[PDB]
């Protein structure tokens, strides 16, 4: 009924609303992780900052899907952001596997959205995804896999050394380009 | 027969030629609108400048489709640019609805071209469209819908106030980034 | 059991966890509002940006309470961020009253936390609140009351004029000091 | 009997004098620690510099309490700064636990002073503490807890690696902002 709504199926409009809730829940989990590794009894502040500046990006990916919902004339329907899966994540390895299994699951939702959009012949949606989400997500998953193998390589002196030499070293340059 | 022609169906080559004529006719209509709101008896110079810098962009979108026709090895076939629909557009609201119904119709042609190109498996054409036309067009339609609802909100002191506070305010920053 | 936990009652640690969920839910509501006033059929982009840069600040107030939970040695317990109350907010006036009734309710929670903290003789908590939350909140409520009376004064040409002359005028200077 | 003495109970004036002696004794202990880790047979110069620039801050906290004693019209009564508890501190871990148990004990004295000051309705004293001592102390204790868990994580190659990668890395930036 919107005046600007054109070639925007309701199945896509609803599949997008379930994708913003996924991004928000994924930003909530990363927020929980980033505030778990700054606890006094873990103190892996490099990992904490990594997950923190990851929640920033996930939430930004959520509001970029909402402004796309408005540009196409859809109606944003919010749902309850379900709480993270765990409150204790454990060693950084068992946490980065719970953060990679959440990306590979969030990336699967993006691929299903792109499959749905190509099924209803929505070129603008497929372009928007291809441009803003898919490549970022495969690069993030690649980075997490690198972190995971480096963590299995130093497997807890090795975990401290990893947080100091890899994660902190990149957190320093984030604060430089920021 | 062109030496560089590769994977460029004649159905796409002809559908593109009908799309440059559409862009040219749409730039002609915007040219008529931009010189209607600078008439002495309308004097909505903000609306005039808006439609003027819109005709610039539509024409640029036409010559970007022609240089794509050359890159792919097609032959540009020009047709008579049919004159605009009206010579009197009336109040700015009834003109911005005749300018939005022309975008949503020009955007439909782009989507049909992208559907045809995906039917003949022309990835370069779909990428070219997705990159240069589709997103620009949905953003322009969104902007026009915003203008339309703001015009219905002030519905003629309100029309003058709108031209002064929205359109002129953005024309000033166009002349800044220009 | 934490090594750094000192003079940090569990009643405060739990009352803080219910305050971060309040801040997150309040940032979720403001996110819903900021993406409701950029809808094509409302197009009060000034109000949209106001609520958007308000959700930023509410969420920042949430992660500043979480890092305080870590500094004092508490354990952050996340809960389901309940979805906003409405999906349609209506005119900007009826939305700014639902955004002020949410501040005066979020400010009441801060005052109850400060009363609890003073009951258990926690000076650091009362100082943290007094410094970072209370004054910001009374200033924000004052600003919202100003907006509300200015909206009742122009009571829909007046609503457009308000969004153009008050909210947009301050959004321009936000983007300047930002 | 002082002309400027107003709302400054003698119980607070005496409790402050016992707090400057505590700060001085704590700066004496940190001075002993900072000159123990530069011994030729320990040579953890990063830890040495950490405790050294910690004694600076503790002593500064002592003379900031003395100038507050003068501003309120009290009389500074000095006592014998009792010598540090140990002359051999051992491994850096067993020293950072003797330096954290001294902070959590110095922070307890500040909280007792703030409880006494609130008992005699001395708002200026509670504000002075809340502003200058309490938050600094909880942040320092948090930092020490981080150091302690990182030291237990690398638990003596790990101790050298810690001193090199954490403590020296921050000593370099101290000498930059200094
Ligand atoms: Fe593409
Ligand atoms: Fe107080
Ligand atoms: Fe205070």
Enumerate the residues of chain C whose CB falls inside 8 A of the CB of residue A4: 40
Residues of A with a Cβ under 8 Å from any B Cβ are 2-4, 6-7, 70-73, 121, 123-124, 126-128, 130
> Among residues D129, D125, D107, D130, which one has the least CA distance to residue C125?
D130
Q: Which residues contact B134 (CB under 8 A, 6 or more apart)?
A: A123, A124, A127, B107, B110, B111, B114
Structure tokens at C86: 């409405």
CA distances from C86 to A123, C48, C82 (A): 32, 16, 12
Enumerate the residues of chain D whose CB falls inside 8 A of the CB of residue A156: 153
Residue of C nearest to B158 (CA): C157
Cα–Cα dist A49/A51, whole Å: 5
Contact between A151 and A96 under an 8 Å Cβ cutoff? The reply is yes
Enumerate the residues of chain C whose CB falls inside 8 A of the CB of residue A67: 35, 38
CA distances from D115 to B73, C101, C124, D5, D123 (A): 85, 35, 11, 21, 11
Cα–Cα dist B127/A126, whole Å: 11
Q: Which residues contact C31 (CB under 8 A, 6 or more apart)?
A: A63, A66, A78, C51, C52, C55
Neighbours of chain C (3+ CB pairs under 8 A): A, B, D
Structure tokens at B58: 């539509």
Q: DSSP states of D38-53 as a string?
A: TSTTT--HHHHHHHHH
Structure tokens at C150: 């200015």
Residue of D nearest to C3 (CA): D145
Residue A125 Cα to ligand 1 midpoint, Å, equals 10
Q: Is D130 annotated as a binding residue?
A: no
Enumerate the residues of chain A whose CB falls inside 8 A of the CB of residue C75: 39, 87
E strands along C53-125, which residues? Answer: none
> Among residues C82, C63, C61, C59, which one has the least CA distance to residue C71?
C63
Residue A164 Cα to ligand 2 midpoint, Å, equals 40
Contact between A68 and A128 under an 8 Å Cβ cutoff? The reply is yes
Question: Would you call B135 and A127 a contact, using CB atoms and an 8 Å cutoff?
Answer: yes
Question: Would you call C3 and D139 a contact, using CB atoms and an 8 Å cutoff?
Answer: no
The angle at the Cα of A155, spanning A154 to A158, to the nearest 5 degrees, equals: 50
The method of structure determination was: cryo-EM
**Ligand with smallest separation from the Cα of D118:** 2
> How close, in Å, is residue A139 to chain D by CA atoms?
29
What 3-state DSSP class applies to C81?
A: strand
Enumerate the residues of chain C whose CB falls inside 8 A of the CB of residue A41: 2-3
Q: List the single best residue of C67, C123, C125 to mutate versus D (max D Cβ within 10 A).
A: C123
> How close, in Å, is residue A140 to chain C by CA atoms?
24
Q: Which residues contact C32 (CB under 8 A, 6 or more apart)?
A: A76, A78, C84, C86, C87
Report the interhelical angle of A92-119 vs A45-71 (nearest 10°): 10
> How close, in Å, is residue A49 to chain C by CA atoms?
12
Residue A127 Cα to ligand 1 midpoint, Å, equals 5
SS3 content of chain A, % helix, strand, coil (to 5): 75, 0, 25
C74 backbone dihedrals φ, ψ, rounded to 5°:
-80, 175
Name the resolution in angstroms. 2.7
Neighbours of chain A (3+ CB pairs under 8 A): B, C, D
Cβ neighbours of D177 (radius 10 Å):
5
Bridge partner residues of A81 (DSSP):
C81
Residue D134 Cα to ligand 2 midpoint, Å, equals 13
Residue of C nearest to A85 (CA): C78
- What burial class does residue C74 get, using C-beta atoms within 10 Å of its C-beta: 0-12 exposed, 13-18 middle, 19+ buried? buried
Bridge partner residues of C81 (DSSP):
A81
Structure tokens at D86: 């140990």
Cβ neighbours of A168 (radius 10 Å):
19
Contact between A117 and A129 under an 8 Å Cβ cutoff? The reply is yes
Structure tokens at A152: 């299995």
CA atoms lying within 13 Å on the CB side of residue A13: 16
Question: Would you call A82 and C82 a contact, using CB atoms and an 8 Å cutoff?
Answer: no
Cα–Cα dist D59/A117, whole Å: 67
Cα–Cα dist A22/A39, whole Å: 26
Question: Would you call A156 and D153 a contact, using CB atoms and an 8 Å cutoff?
Answer: yes
Residues of A with a Cβ under 8 Å from any C Cβ are 2-4, 24, 28, 31-32, 35-36, 38-41, 63, 66-67, 69-70, 73, 75-84, 87
Q: Mark C78-109 as b/e (b = at least 16 C-beta within 10 Å).
A: beebebbeeeebeebbebbbbbbebbeebbeb
What 3-state DSSP class applies to A154?
A: coil
Residue C16 Cα to ligand 3 midpoint, Å, equals 19
> How close, in Å, is residue A164 to chain D by CA atoms?
7
Cα–Cα dist D89/D99, whole Å: 10
Residue of A nearest to B144 (CA): A4
Question: Would you call C82 and A80 a contact, using CB atoms and an 8 Å cutoff?
Answer: yes
Structure tokens at A103: 């990306």
Contact between D123 and D61 under an 8 Å Cβ cutoff? The reply is no
CA distances from B85 to B23, B88, B91, C78 (A): 15, 9, 16, 60
What 3-state DSSP class applies to A81?
A: strand
CA distances from C62 to B8, B10, C28, C48, C130 (A): 56, 59, 11, 21, 15
Enumerate the residues of chain A whose CB falls inside 8 A of the CB of residue D162: 160
Enumerate the residues of chain A whose CB falls inside 8 A of the CB of residue C32: 76, 78
Enumerate the residues of chain D whose CB falls inside 8 A of the CB of residue A42: 149
Residues of C with a Cβ under 8 Å from any B Cβ are 40-43, 45, 156-157, 159-161, 164-165
Cα–Cα dist B48/B25, whole Å: 18
Contact between A98 and A86 under an 8 Å Cβ cutoff? The reply is yes
Q: DSSP states of A94-152 as a string?
A: HHHHHHHHHHHHHHHHHHHHHHHHHHTT-HHHHHHHIIIIIHHHHHHHHHHHHHHHHHH
CA distances from C103 to B56, C25, C134, C144 (A): 47, 12, 11, 9
């Amino acid at each position: 009924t919107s005046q600007i709504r054109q070639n925007y199926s309701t199945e896509v409009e609803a599949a997008v609303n379930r994708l913003v809730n996924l991004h928000l829940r994924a930003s909530y989990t990363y927020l929980s992780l980033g505030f778990f590794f700054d606890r006094d009894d873990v103190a892996l502040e490099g990992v904490g900052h990594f997950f923190r500046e990851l929640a920033e990006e996930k939430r930004e990916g959520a509001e970029r899907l909402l402004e796309f919902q408005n540009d196409r004339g859809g109606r944003a329907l919010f749902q309850d952001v379900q709480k993270p899966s765990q409150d204790e994540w454990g060693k950084t390895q068992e946490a980065m596997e719970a953060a990679l299994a959440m990306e590979k699951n969030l990336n699967q939702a993006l691929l299903d959205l792109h499959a749905l959009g190509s099924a209803r012949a929505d070129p603008h949606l497929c372009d928007f995804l291809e441009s803003h989400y898919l490549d970022k997500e495969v690069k993030l998953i690649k980075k997490m896999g690198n972190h995971l193998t480096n963590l299995r390589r130093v497997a807890s002196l090795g975990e401290y050394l990893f947080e100091r030499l890899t994660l902190k070293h990149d957190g320093d340059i984030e604060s430089a380009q920021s």
